[PDB]
Design a protein around this ligand. Structure first.
Ligand SMILES: CCCC[P+](CCCC)(CCCC)CCCC
Lengths: 173, 172
């Protein structure tokens, strides 16, 4: 297990999407889970559930795509958390921006206080906070704080929880 | 100048990515300024620079893709037909989290001062800020502020400006 951020940049949209197609084919081949986002001339690809040697191989693939499609490539790695696979995600919603950003400040100081690392995204009236590397007891407290901020600033809250880092997709036919 | 947000949801990743391919082909076929983001089983497609009648047509296309690939579809719409928009993306990088978040606060204070709307994303050592609703003179000012913040907090900065169709990238 490990995370990897790969960034493709190029002015040719078609070549960029050809590189995407191949990169995520390689990642999925090594049992990677890919997240990606295309905006303008930039393509960002987040690959999770991949150990060290797999990341080394995917890096090789990224370097090869750089030559084949004439694009710029940069990649970054966690790189190696000692212990990991303990995740929580919180979503705040409200029409008051000022209150939302107060909630953000309190939640991430709290999360960092319990030695958790945060990622957050504010867009419109929706604020998303992702907290990783956080065990069961900590999530219980962070949930309390979420409920505290919920009541205090009169905003909406919802949660999604990952505990095993094993992801199950169900298909019905 | 109106925009549009289309969201695809489905359990079949391959079918989901087929729907994406067809949707953005249609979106690009018209006016079509396309941005998209895939995460888990949810796919978000953001379309800008599309007038009233085009957005109506793209909605029909999405409903058709729903039937063809057996996926869930929801979409939201905004507009319409204006000169501004005028979009700005700024990127801060640095090893000092406290300094990054200080730069964030100053940057969004300025943008909101000039009646601009901000969206931002912090992950690891990278901070990205999308600023909308800001005309050319304002973007030049926000660009100066970005360069000022570079020196003060000792962080890496680059900004890009999109008006069309035409997008300008500035590197430091
Ligand atoms: C590496 C994927 C990042 C996707 P975004 C942030 C989501 C975080 C969970 C891009 C941030 C804009 C500033 C979602 C925007 C795409 C429509």
């Amino acid at each position: 297990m490990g995370e990897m951020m790969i960034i493709f940049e190029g002015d040719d949209l078609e070549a960029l999407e050809k590189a995407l197609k191949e990169m995520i084919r390689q990642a999925r081949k090594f049992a990677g889970t890919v997240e990606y986002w295309l905006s303008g001339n930039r393509l960002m690809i987040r690959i999770t559930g991949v150990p060290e040697q797999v990341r080394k191989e995917l890096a090789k693939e990224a370097e090869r795509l750089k030559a084949e499609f004439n694009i710029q490539v940069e990649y970054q790695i966690r790189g190696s958390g000692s212990g990991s696979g303990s995740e929580m995600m919180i979503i705040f919603e409200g029409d008051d921006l000022e209150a939302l950003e107060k909630a953000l400040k309190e939640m991430i100081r709290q999360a960092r206080k319990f030695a958790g690392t945060v990622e957050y995204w504010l867009s419109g009236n929706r604020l998303m906070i992702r907290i990783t590397g956080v065990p069961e007891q900590v999530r219980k407290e962070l949930a309390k704080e979420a409920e505290r901020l919920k009541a205090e600033f009169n905003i909406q809250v919802e949660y999604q929880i990952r505990t095993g880092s094993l992801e199950h997709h169900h298909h019905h036919h």
